[PDB]
Design a protein around this ligand. Structure first.
Ligand SMILES: *[C@@H]1O[C@H](CO)[C@@H](O)[C@H](O)[C@H]1NC(C)=O
Ligand SMILES: *[C@@H]1O[C@H](CO)[C@@H](O)[C@H](O)[C@H]1NC(C)=O
Ligand SMILES: [Ca+2]
Ligand SMILES: [Ca+2]
Lengths: 635, 99, 272, 635, 272, 99
């Protein structure tokens, strides 16, 4: 039919689609609180699995996993002030919420206030954290990150709360949920699938914290603040109530008894087979589980997934749409515990996805506001994202999304809490996540107030905004499966490489001191650029009609994201091997992080680690280039 | 549990001297499939012999069929000796002209 | 009129030289059509209508299913021997599996294991489990039921695949598989002073089902008078069966032989 | 042209080819001793690089590496018999040969005699090896293995020699060369390429021995035997001269001063581009370097490489042969130090070879005798090897090579000293090695007597035997590039899987005790079998003329070998990831090796290690199956 | 008659907001044909014969080469600033590279770097090295010469690629690139008691090369008498140049203006 | 080394009141390319102005050309002010009718 026709078919299809009905339908007592592994979870899974069948998709199947999550024990968790002088006890709160994967323990000591728990915040702190409990604000980073940062500074226990400034909620007694696993997937099947074939060997994710972590209401935070001194830095721009450090006479005792619980997770899939190369495909997914009502955290996403799967089924069965490649629709569970369902899938079907699944689109938390439209994704999808922003209109402004021509240089990378993170960092599958959000975090996420009532009350034009989201996802899908060319712009990596070189000149002195050169890395990004040019040329001189020669060129494209996964580290111990977006010493940022230590001439800096870091990053890049250029003998 | 074979010698068509017929030996009900069978003529093992495919019945007991093309005379004697583990000496069964 | 497809597998431990211990037999409506041998593990046909009418495609599927079952049963055989603490011993494992399709097309499936010539485990599709025929079979019973996968797979085969392959084999057979030839009945008789024995042979017929009973004074005698028909096989897909009757020296002619067979219109009555 | 025509063209081409001339040409003072990195090495490299140009191949290029080998120092190495005070006493020998990568050191203690140094030989030894020097016979295994086995038993130093029985040489003063690196490639760039871009970071292969190892003449061995007691076990079937353990009063002092030396290696390549899918290819190679004359160890191989590259160039340019896929001819160097040139190539161009290079054929030591024709290779090449043996005739017997129908179940796996080993165990490229050999090891390998004079004198019908080798290699090449189907028989892996299951029933009791099942592994080999069947079926129902659908199926085939590389270990620390033919705990044999320890109920056995070993081997297999079966949704 | 192709690059440090600091100019026979800008990093054409005659293919190659050079030079700029300990300072880097093809087709290539408006490094193809124009350039000189790759690549471009692309541009130009228009000469003159000044303007011509000299009494004066022709540009690919001469009030008519130009057959002599 | 611009104002065609011509301002030889130029009419900056592409000469000195379409009269005055870093106040150059 051609882009313009597809664009229109999709558009009209959307205009007559009621997202509001679906989102609201997903908030009925039938699926109210849907914690991963719960009946309500399973119910919603069956509902979706059935909708897929109704939509009559090429095939609809499900995967079943047995994973270990953590729930609160029969014994209440608590935060109590223990009065040194005469061991008198206060009792600040018996929290309704909790942090999954916190260590079960009970500790007590001084309560120091870090801020957000950022690695930097601890750095600029005055009071040493060593040996005491830390209290931090939700935001800026992951709980797991906060807890991991505190633990590396020998803190004991972490208390997390929502200040009224960042989280302007009325009810200060409101509690919330989160997980502290510094990773993704079932933390007890690290780097491998939670399948009975595995006979679940004793394996413990190194991302599991070794100190307790608890969630407390704002009220509780203020009560603790009534026993602390020292005005909270104005720099923090936070409540006029907080203060750091407790009065020498008083200290707190945190006690959490959370227990592990093995559960059954269900991942529901649906595929629309392609018409030319069905073996290659796109994956579109959304989280189904939620701690509370999860309207915004789970509903909107799942609603979008259902609709999209429907519209594309029609377009294919009615409007005669004929995607060359397949489209998979997936509803995952245990996302609240760290994109578990999704990670287990990727680790389970690794060999089947390799160079076959070529892009992932996440639909979670797609609608949280109206003011902005943010995006996080592999550079390979920037151009596609751009073109899409140029032809899609803001649900309220009526204007085009493309309003800033420098948007690409402001793109924030994918984070651990995003289901797209595993796909890109571990699988090597270019992924993307986007939202119509605000400059403020959607306050109710992870709380009991994340309900439809609140969602629409906050954003009344929900249905229209949901439509806009559906439209951008819809277009990504069309563009990616529509015709002979994959809209994956590998040229975008030249800017990332150059930027790494820029991040590196401040350390040219150090490199020089170690008697090393940056010339080989420099010539590497050079050779990559050459390679991209050679490939774009090959496309240019090709007859877009010869489906064979075009297959060959697109193969080179699908391998680009993959070749940035480090071939020198263990996928089990370091799943996030992508040298640009992963985690670990094999990472490019990690190379810089080490080099930064060489400033304060004291231990920290590991030179042999660095000399190796450099040798490998350099070659991982030259290699990516030599492959992109095609045929060994033509290098 | 081991089981001894059941030897049954007979002809395809009613014996009629001078007319080339067929001499069958059909062992059945024996267990350890391992078994050897020979068709004798006047006490001599005949060559150019044929047999079907070893198989077994519901009770897991095996059965096999051997058969040779032959021309009957009132002078010649026919019989097959079956050697199995359940047998001390190779049990012989002569061909009763009537059957 | 119900049709059936079933395979037979038979293996021995001690004897051999290279893993994979089974030989197999394929039967469609009790008609041997395929044979997987020991030496030179290959799938040869039996009966002309298959060694010609069977497409190159279907034969591949058949070859693989047989080689597969060989491997699968070889593992099971090892498993079962070991759960009996057997090893330096020579044992045998036999398996029979197939489906039976009724006139209304409904199907019934079966899968049985025979250890050393005796019932060991019987697969029960409706409950995704197995029934141990004897105490020493319970270990294996449990070991297989924990897995959960095995049962679901076995059921899938019996419920989906087997029936399907039976269909293909039938259409492919219409002509030589239902081609029934009538029997050549011949009443003979050996005499002695002791008594006179009557032998009624039904020659070169097909299929195997047939009815042979004696008639005294052209009337039906009781089944107790003679032994049941003795069906024998000829090395050519044709069978022959006979029934004997001892009678008072002289009353010969007083007895007749009645032979019912689908390959005959009305019941044939022979007299010598 | 079709198989039969190609078969014939090749045949006649061969009949008029003079291998003898080339082998002899490779032994002229021009390239007499060609140690890796030497001028003579470089000379022979240029000769070959030029022959490739003369043959007019699609393209001929060269790779240049800077690796670290080890040579003997200006100070002589020595073996001396000493008196309890360290006093000089005998001085057995100042060895002409040496063992590359031995530790530079000087030690002294009692000299115990192990046999061949096999892990088992040490096991069944009477005298403890702990704390003393070991002496062993060349053979059965690698020096590196011998040295590694001794070192794990706390031995110090290892002396290696050739007994007159296994090595019936006249001159007992003859010395020899070898290397003790338990790995492949430059041991100082483990798991990565020896390229200046690397700036050679400090990295040391964990396969480098930490004790000295020296080579001694037979004469020397006998002199040491004159100071030892205890008749050498008749079981060993060795010289009537050896004895184990020295007289309590006497002990030996081994002293080796070998030094590292950085050198420049040259890998010369030549390619014959394919006519349909040039991007896919076969690699055929041979070692060029040699310690001495290296006639048999290097000459024959390189001679074969030159001829083969010629014949196929003609066939393509004259006889109109048109291979669908490419053919690469490679002459590597530093093979004597552990297939260094070859390994550096694989580590250097990893990303370019992935799923592109689909088979490797090694030509080293292809002719060492006449009696037998042995073969070592991936099961995927068994069928091809079989068919080839059925139509190729023994150069002397005149009979067909296929004489034993059970040959496949007697195939010995690839070993560290074989250049094919890295290709299969590290790269995931099905590889093969073969020879016309004897039941006796070619005595002169690694000595000064491995010359043409000796080679032809021992096997006078050299030219004819060399032709037979060339013919089998030639046919492999045709078969692999000739038509639409790759002669890679993935069904052969069903027998390997079943065999692993057999190797495992002796441990069913142990598995049961640990409360584990073997049912999932059992169902895994089941699912693999199903998968192979499904793929063979797909080929069956395919029109061998639709080059597109055929590409898709062959892709599934090329991924088979690759999916057996463990995705759970680090390629840098454990390069040989192939679970069937690699080395390391991720290996299938390793799983058995651990399980065997559970017999003698004492420490050794690591259960958690095992529970993990099982979980991963099981899933690596189910995964290989789920991928082989095609399309995730169709599982 | 030698042709030339050369690109010009210019970047400033302090000013910008997103790495990649260069703008570029492409010239074929001193004819601006392409421009790589700062804002919206895109390659726009200059002159109609390119914004039409240049194939979609060639333009791609051109776009990439320019974006590439941008990136490559951006790195070099960073390198050079750092080897000067420069950073919180605003500097400039300029590069000029191209090839010059002679009648016999032989080619000469060049590549130069200008740091803060002054010669810094000059690439020498015949020796695969660079020559530092000043002491502070030596660090970079050495740093690039260790690499070895850089030089070989730069040479490859100048020797192989550049010449090749110049060819394509010429064939593609035959018509509007060698289309030379003659000048419209006009002698004017300003008078005062002091003296009378004569101005001879050569209007709207192309190319730029032209000859303008004064003639006293129809004879050739010395070059010392007047300043050299002052060539100026018009925003339309046409140029104009003028020469001035001061003469004794009254002798006006005694002087004439001679203008030689390839766009004219015989030298034009103008008189006011 | 910094360099101050060289301002040159002139016309495309010989000035002739009433006839729409072109007013050029051509700065050259300046270094820090960063430079601003305005074309004035009776002391006022003219809009709808055009300019060529910034470029430079062998000595790395930059040069840029600005030009507007205009109709000259003896009443109106034309000139361009050039502001550079090498200049204290924006140097102005008026258009000499003769050139
Ligand atoms: C899989 O394992 C889990 C936990 O070990 C167990 O609860 C469940 O019943 C098992 N399921 C199957 C099908 O074996
Ligand atoms: C590479 O390094 C080796 C020694 O490390 C040296 O001899 C050679 O010249 C170097 N080559 C380059 C281009 O730096
Ligand atoms: Ca997992
Ligand atoms: Ca290496």
């Amino acid at each position: 039919l051609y882009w313009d026709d597809l664009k229109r078919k999709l558009s009209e299809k959307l205009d007559s689609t009621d997202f509001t009905s679906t989102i609201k339908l997903l908030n009925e007592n039938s699926y109210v609180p849907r914690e991963a592994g719960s009946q309500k979870d399973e119910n919603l899974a069956l509902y979706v699995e059935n909708q897929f069948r109704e939509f009559k998709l090429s095939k609809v199947w499900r995967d079943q996993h047995f994973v270990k999550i953590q729930v609160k024990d029969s014994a209440q968790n608590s935060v109590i002030i223990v009065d040194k002088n005469g061991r008198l006890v206060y009792l600040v709160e018996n929290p309704g919420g909790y942090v999954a994967y916190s260590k079960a323990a009970t500790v007590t000591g001084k309560l120091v206030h870090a801020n957000f728990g950022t690695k930097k915040d601890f750095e600029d702190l005055y009071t040493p954290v060593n040996g005491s409990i830390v209290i931090v604000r939700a935001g800026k980073i992951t709980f797991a990150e906060k807890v991991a940062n505190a633990e590396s500074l020998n803190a004991i226990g972490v208390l997390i709360y929502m200040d009224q400034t960042k989280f302007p909620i009325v009810n200060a007694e409101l509690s919330f949920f989160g997980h502290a696993h510094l990773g993704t997937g079932d933390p007890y099947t690290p780097g491998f699938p939670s399948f009975n074939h595995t006979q679940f060997p004793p394996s413990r994710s190194s991302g599991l914290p070794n100190i307790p972590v608890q969630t407390i209401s704002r009220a509780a935070a203020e009560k603790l603040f009534g026993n602390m001194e020292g005005d909270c830095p104005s720099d923090w721009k936070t409540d006029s109530t907080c203060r750091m450090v407790t009065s020498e006479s008083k200290n707190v005792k945190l006690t959490v008894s959370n227990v592990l619980k093995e559960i059954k997770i269900l991942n529901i899939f649906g595929v629309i087979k392609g018409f030319v190369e069905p073996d290659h495909y796109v994956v579109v997914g959304a989280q189904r589980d939620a701690w509370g009502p999860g309207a915004a955290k789970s509903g909107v996403g799942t609603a979008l997934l259902l609709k999209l799967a429907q519209m594309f089924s029609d377009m294919v069965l009615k409007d005669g749409f004929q995607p060359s490649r397949s489209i998979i629709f997936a509803s995952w569970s245990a996302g609240d515990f760290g994109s578990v369902g999704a990670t287990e899938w990727l680790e389970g079907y690794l060999s089947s996805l390799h160079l076959k699944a070529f892009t992932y689109i996440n639909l979670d938390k797609a609608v949280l506001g109206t003011s902005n439209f943010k995006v996080s994704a592999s550079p390979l999808l920037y151009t596609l994202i751009e073109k899409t922003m140029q032809n899609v209109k803001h649900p309220v402004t009526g204007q085009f999304l493309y309003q800033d021509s420098n948007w690409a240089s402001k793109v924030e990378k994918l984070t651990l809490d995003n289901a797209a993170f595993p796909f890109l960092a571990y699988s090597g599958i270019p992924a993307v996540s986007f939202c119509f959000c605000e400059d403020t975090d959607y306050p109710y996420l992870g709380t009991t107030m994340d309900t439809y009532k609140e969602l629409i009350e906050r954003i009344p034009e929900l249905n229209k905004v949901a439509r806009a989201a559906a439209e951008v996802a819809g277009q990504f899908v069309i563009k990616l499966t529509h015709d002979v060319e994959l809209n994956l712009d590998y040229e975008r990596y030249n800017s990332q490489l150059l930027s790494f070189v820029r991040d590196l000149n401040q350390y040219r002195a150090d490199i020089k001191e170690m008697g090393l050169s940056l010339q080989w890395l420099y010539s590497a990004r050079g050779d990559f650029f050459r390679a991209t040019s050679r490939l774009t040329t090959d496309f240019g001189n090709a007859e877009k009609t010869d489906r064979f020669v075009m297959k060959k060129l697109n193969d080179r494209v699908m391998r680009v994201e993959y070749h940035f996964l480090s071939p020198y580290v263990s996928p089990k111990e370091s799943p996030f091997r992508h040298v640009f977006w992963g985690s670990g010493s094999h990472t490019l940022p990690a190379l810089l992080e080490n080099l930064k230590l060489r400033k304060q001439n004291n231990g920290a800096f590991n030179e042999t680690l660095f000399r190796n870091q450099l040798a490998l990053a350099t070659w991982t890049i030259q290699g990516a280039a030599n492959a992109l250029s095609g045929d060994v003998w033509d290098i | 549990i081991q089981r001894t074979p059941k030897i049954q010698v007979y002809s395809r068509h009613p014996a009629e001297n001078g007319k080339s017929n067929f001499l069958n030996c059909y062992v059945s009900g024996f267990h350890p499939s391992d078994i050897e069978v020979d068709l004798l003529k006047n006490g001599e093992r005949i060559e150019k012999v044929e047999h079907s495919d070893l198989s077994f019945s519901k009770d897991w007991s095996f059965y096999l069929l051997y058969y040779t093309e032959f021309t009957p005379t009132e002078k010649d004697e026919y019989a097959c000796r079956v050697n199995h583990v359940t047998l001390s000496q190779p049990k012989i069964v002569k061909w009763d002209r009537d059957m | 009129r119900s049709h059936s497809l079933h395979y037979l597998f038979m293996g021995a431990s001690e004897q051999d030289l290279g893993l994979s211990l089974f030989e197999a037999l394929g039967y469609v409506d009790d008609q041997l059509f395929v044979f997987y041998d020991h030496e030179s593990r290959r799938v040869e046909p039996r009966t002309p209508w298959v060694s010609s009418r069977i497409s190159s495609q279907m034969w591949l599927q058949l070859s693989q299913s047989l080689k597969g079952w060989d491997h699968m049963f070889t593992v099971d055989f090892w498993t079962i021997m070991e759960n009996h603490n057997h090893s330096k011993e020579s044992h045998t494992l036999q398996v029979i599996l197939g489906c039976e399709m009724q006139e209304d097309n409904s199907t019934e499936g079966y899968w049985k294991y025979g250890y050393d010539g005796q019932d060991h485990l019987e697969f029960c599709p409706d409950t995704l489990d197995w029934r141990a025929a004897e105490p020493r079979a319970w270990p294996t019973k449990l070991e297989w039921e924990r897995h959960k996968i095995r049962a679901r797979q076995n059921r899938a085969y019996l419920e989906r695949d087997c029936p399907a392959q039976l269909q293909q084999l039938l259409e492919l057979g219409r002509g030589v598989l239902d081609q029934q030839v009538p029997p050549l009945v011949k009443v003979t008789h050996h005499v002695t002073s002791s008594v006179t024995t009557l032998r009624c042979r039904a020659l070169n017929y097909y299929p195997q089902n047939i009815t042979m009973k004696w008639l005294k004074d052209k009337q039906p005698m009781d089944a107790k008078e003679f032994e049941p028909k003795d069906v024998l096989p000829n090395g050519d897909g044709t069978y022959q069966g006979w029934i004997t009757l001892a009678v008072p020296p002289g009353e010969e002619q007083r007895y007749t032989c009645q032979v019912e067979h689908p390959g005959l219109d009305q019941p044939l009555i022979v007299i010598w």
